[PDB]
Design a protein around this motif. Structure first.
Motif, PDB file in Angstrom:
ATOM      1  N   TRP A  25     -23.069 -13.393  62.895  1.00  0.00           N
ATOM      2  CA  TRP A  25     -23.343 -12.907  61.534  1.00  0.00           C
ATOM      3  C   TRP A  25     -24.711 -12.243  61.395  1.00  0.00           C
ATOM      4  O   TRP A  25     -25.707 -12.919  61.625  1.00  0.00           O
ATOM      5  CB  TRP A  25     -23.199 -14.059  60.535  1.00  0.00           C
ATOM      6  CG  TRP A  25     -22.973 -13.666  59.109  1.00  0.00           C
ATOM      7  CD1 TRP A  25     -23.028 -12.415  58.567  1.00  0.00           C
ATOM      8  CD2 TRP A  25     -22.646 -14.552  58.027  1.00  0.00           C
ATOM      9  NE1 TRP A  25     -22.766 -12.467  57.226  1.00  0.00           N
ATOM     10  CE2 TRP A  25     -22.529 -13.762  56.865  1.00  0.00           C
ATOM     11  CE3 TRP A  25     -22.437 -15.931  57.926  1.00  0.00           C
ATOM     12  CZ2 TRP A  25     -22.201 -14.305  55.625  1.00  0.00           C
ATOM     13  CZ3 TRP A  25     -22.117 -16.466  56.699  1.00  0.00           C
ATOM     14  CH2 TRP A  25     -21.999 -15.663  55.566  1.00  0.00           C
ATOM     15  N   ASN A  26     -24.714 -10.962  61.044  1.00  0.00           N
ATOM     16  CA  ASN A  26     -25.978 -10.291  60.662  1.00  0.00           C
ATOM     17  C   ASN A  26     -26.205 -10.787  59.229  1.00  0.00           C
ATOM     18  O   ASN A  26     -25.482 -10.342  58.358  1.00  0.00           O
ATOM     19  CB  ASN A  26     -25.897  -8.764  60.757  1.00  0.00           C
ATOM     20  CG  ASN A  26     -27.176  -8.051  60.369  1.00  0.00           C
ATOM     21  OD1 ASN A  26     -27.815  -8.379  59.377  1.00  0.00           O
ATOM     22  ND2 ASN A  26     -27.547  -7.052  61.142  1.00  0.00           N
ATOM     23  N   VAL A  27     -27.221 -11.612  59.017  1.00  0.00           N
ATOM     24  CA  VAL A  27     -27.443 -12.275  57.697  1.00  0.00           C
ATOM     25  C   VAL A  27     -28.349 -11.457  56.757  1.00  0.00           C
ATOM     26  O   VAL A  27     -28.531 -11.880  55.631  1.00  0.00           O
ATOM     27  CB  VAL A  27     -27.967 -13.696  57.970  1.00  0.00           C
ATOM     28  CG1 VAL A  27     -26.945 -14.514  58.737  1.00  0.00           C
ATOM     29  CG2 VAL A  27     -29.291 -13.685  58.715  1.00  0.00           C
ATOM     30  N   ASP A  28     -28.913 -10.349  57.244  1.00  0.00           N
ATOM     31  CA  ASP A  28     -29.780  -9.473  56.409  1.00  0.00           C
ATOM     32  C   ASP A  28     -30.842 -10.305  55.678  1.00  0.00           C
ATOM     33  O   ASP A  28     -30.907 -10.245  54.471  1.00  0.00           O
ATOM     34  CB  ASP A  28     -28.963  -8.653  55.417  1.00  0.00           C
ATOM     35  CG  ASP A  28     -29.782  -7.576  54.732  1.00  0.00           C
ATOM     36  OD1 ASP A  28     -30.554  -6.907  55.433  1.00  0.00           O
ATOM     37  OD2 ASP A  28     -29.679  -7.472  53.499  1.00  0.00           O
ATOM     38  N   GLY A  29     -31.596 -11.101  56.425  1.00  0.00           N
ATOM     39  CA  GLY A  29     -32.591 -11.980  55.806  1.00  0.00           C
ATOM     40  C   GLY A  29     -32.117 -13.411  55.736  1.00  0.00           C
ATOM     41  O   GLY A  29     -31.490 -13.739  54.746  1.00  0.00           O
ATOM     42  N   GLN A  53     -28.165 -12.525  63.360  1.00  0.00           N
ATOM     43  CA  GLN A  53     -28.991 -11.322  63.592  1.00  0.00           C
ATOM     44  C   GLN A  53     -29.708 -10.950  62.286  1.00  0.00           C
ATOM     45  O   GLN A  53     -29.194 -11.279  61.216  1.00  0.00           O
ATOM     46  CB  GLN A  53     -28.148 -10.202  64.209  1.00  0.00           C
ATOM     47  CG  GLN A  53     -27.383 -10.573  65.467  1.00  0.00           C
ATOM     48  CD  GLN A  53     -26.012 -11.103  65.142  1.00  0.00           C
ATOM     49  OE1 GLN A  53     -25.370 -10.655  64.203  1.00  0.00           O
ATOM     50  NE2 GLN A  53     -25.583 -12.100  65.892  1.00  0.00           N
ATOM     51  N   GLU A  54     -30.825 -10.234  62.396  1.00  0.00           N
ATOM     52  CA  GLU A  54     -31.627  -9.846  61.208  1.00  0.00           C
ATOM     53  C   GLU A  54     -32.065 -11.093  60.440  1.00  0.00           C
ATOM     54  O   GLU A  54     -31.898 -11.133  59.235  1.00  0.00           O
ATOM     55  CB  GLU A  54     -30.947  -8.763  60.381  1.00  0.00           C
ATOM     56  CG  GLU A  54     -31.562  -7.403  60.591  1.00  0.00           C
ATOM     57  CD  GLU A  54     -31.042  -6.322  59.669  1.00  0.00           C
ATOM     58  OE1 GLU A  54     -29.879  -5.927  59.823  1.00  0.00           O
ATOM     59  OE2 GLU A  54     -31.812  -5.877  58.808  1.00  0.00           O
ATOM     60  N   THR A  55     -32.593 -12.070  61.158  1.00  0.00           N
ATOM     61  CA  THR A  55     -33.127 -13.291  60.526  1.00  0.00           C
ATOM     62  C   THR A  55     -34.341 -12.916  59.669  1.00  0.00           C
ATOM     63  O   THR A  55     -34.526 -13.540  58.635  1.00  0.00           O
ATOM     64  CB  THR A  55     -33.468 -14.320  61.607  1.00  0.00           C
ATOM     65  OG1 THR A  55     -34.526 -13.783  62.393  1.00  0.00           O
ATOM     66  CG2 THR A  55     -32.269 -14.708  62.443  1.00  0.00           C
ATOM     67  N   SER A 264     -24.672 -11.265  52.724  1.00  0.00           N
ATOM     68  CA  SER A 264     -25.297 -10.154  53.482  1.00  0.00           C
ATOM     69  C   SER A 264     -24.533  -8.853  53.233  1.00  0.00           C
ATOM     70  O   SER A 264     -23.562  -8.897  52.500  1.00  0.00           O
ATOM     71  CB  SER A 264     -25.345 -10.474  54.985  1.00  0.00           C
ATOM     72  OG  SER A 264     -25.775  -9.385  55.776  1.00  0.00           O
ATOM     73  N   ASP A 265     -24.994  -7.749  53.812  1.00  0.00           N
ATOM     74  CA  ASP A 265     -24.251  -6.467  53.772  1.00  0.00           C
ATOM     75  C   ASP A 265     -23.289  -6.485  54.964  1.00  0.00           C
ATOM     76  O   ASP A 265     -22.443  -5.604  55.057  1.00  0.00           O
ATOM     77  CB  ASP A 265     -25.173  -5.249  53.715  1.00  0.00           C
ATOM     78  CG  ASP A 265     -26.367  -5.300  54.640  1.00  0.00           C
ATOM     79  OD1 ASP A 265     -26.419  -6.202  55.474  1.00  0.00           O
ATOM     80  OD2 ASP A 265     -27.227  -4.432  54.503  1.00  0.00           O
ATOM     81  N   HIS A 266     -23.474  -7.442  55.862  1.00  0.00           N
ATOM     82  CA  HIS A 266     -22.487  -7.620  56.945  1.00  0.00           C
ATOM     83  C   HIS A 266     -21.645  -8.852  56.653  1.00  0.00           C
ATOM     84  O   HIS A 266     -22.141  -9.768  56.018  1.00  0.00           O
ATOM     85  CB  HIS A 266     -23.103  -7.810  58.329  1.00  0.00           C
ATOM     86  CG  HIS A 266     -23.813  -6.622  58.861  1.00  0.00           C
ATOM     87  ND1 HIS A 266     -23.415  -5.998  60.008  1.00  0.00           N
ATOM     88  CD2 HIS A 266     -24.914  -5.977  58.437  1.00  0.00           C
ATOM     89  CE1 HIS A 266     -24.226  -5.005  60.267  1.00  0.00           C
ATOM     90  NE2 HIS A 266     -25.152  -4.970  59.319  1.00  0.00           N
TER      91      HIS A 266
HETATM   92 MN   LIG Z   1     -29.378  -4.566  57.971  1.00  0.00          MN
END
Ligand SMILES: [Mn+2]
Length: 275
Positions: A25-29, A53-55, A264-266
């Motif tokens: 999961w790309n968590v976007d923050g 990803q994108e922690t 997230s956006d992902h």
């Molecule tokens: Mn992103």
DNA sequence: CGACGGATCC
DNA sequence: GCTGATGCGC
DNA sequence: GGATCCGTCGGGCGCATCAGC
């Protein structure tokens, strides 16, 4: 058009039951994702291994709720030392890996983009591949990274099968995004990034779990811009993947896209393996 | 980067 | 310490 | 003259820093 992920296939073609469930999961923050109930979704998914990803968070600033995950007690974190607030990857596991490493051998370096975890029967790599950027300003950098990553993955010494998961920052084919024609000069759908993905699959070599099971399935995406209500309209991109060594295809039960999971956006992706 | 305005193609 | 503006990266 | 192509523009969100108080 809309997409409804098929039901979970938890049984191998040979009839063997799934023993391993990995979620990426790309968590976007990470911090924002937790406030948006991301860990509640993770608890309902109950995966043996969670890759993030994108922690955008150093380990010292991880929320305490991460220390209240007894089914995912073994945690490994990598953020960029000189890019505070950007990139950052994490791997959380029920069982301890035999070995954990960071980076692709030779970068620039603490880039916070790659975690390699060796288990008994397989090596897991999670990655947040560098974006080409608005106006393609970092496209050449991406091309150089792609080559270095391909070589690193191929040159792994372990003769163990490989699972590569995460945000590979590329929609491989036109089926992997809603607007292929308008995005050929946009980051994620350049011929250079698509070629890099194809080179990655042939060099290591690797197979796309989702596309192997669903070769002609359109509208299946893992990312939607927060802008212009793209998620409600399903205008998205498949940038998140589980790539596997050929030896692991008999063990492949399913590759899922958790379209409804928010934070997230992902959206998260889930792999079921019968090991 | 999707929305949109304007050009181009049969 | 907290809010909001700005900058950066998508 | 509908369909397609292509170039241009304004915006969602997270996090860092800073200014004010
Ligand atoms: Mn992103």
């Amino acid at each position: 058009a809309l997409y409804e992920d098929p039901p979970d296939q938890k049984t191998s073609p040979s009839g063997k039951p799934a023993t391993l469930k990995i979620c990426s999961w790309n968590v976007d923050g990470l911090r924002a994702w937790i406030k948006k109930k991301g860990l509640d979704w993770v608890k309902e998914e109950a995966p043996d291994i969670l890759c993030l990803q994108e922690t955008k968070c150093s380990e010292n600033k991880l929320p305490a709720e991460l220390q209240e995950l007894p089914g995912l007690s073994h945690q490994y974190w990598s953020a960029p030392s000189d890019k505070e607030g950007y990139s950052g990857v994490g791997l959380l596991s029920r069982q301890a890996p035999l070995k954990v490493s960071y980076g692709i051998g030779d970068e620039e370096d603490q880039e916070g983009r790659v975690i390699v975890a060796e288990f008994d029967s397989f090596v897991l790599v999670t990655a947040y591949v560098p974006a080409a950027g608005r106006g393609l300003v970092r496209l050449e950098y991406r091309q150089r990274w792609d080559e270095a990553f391909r070589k690193f993955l191929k040159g792994l010494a372990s003769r163990k099968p490989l699972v590569l998961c995460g945000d590979l920052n590329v929609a491989h084919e036109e089926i992997d995004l809603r607007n292929p024609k308008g995005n050929k000069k946009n980051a994620g759908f350049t011929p250079q990034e698509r070629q890099g993905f194809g080179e990655l699959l042939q060099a290591v070599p690797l197979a796309d779990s989702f596309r192997h099971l669903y070769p002609n399935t359109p509208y299946a995406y893992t990312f939607w811009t927060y802008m212009m209500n793209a998620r409600s309209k399903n205008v998205g991109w498949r940038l998140d993947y589980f790539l596997l060594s050929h030896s692991l295809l008999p063990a492949l039960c399913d590759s899922k896209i958790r379209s409804k999971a928010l934070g997230s956006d992902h959206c998260p992706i889930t792999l079921y393996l019968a090991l």
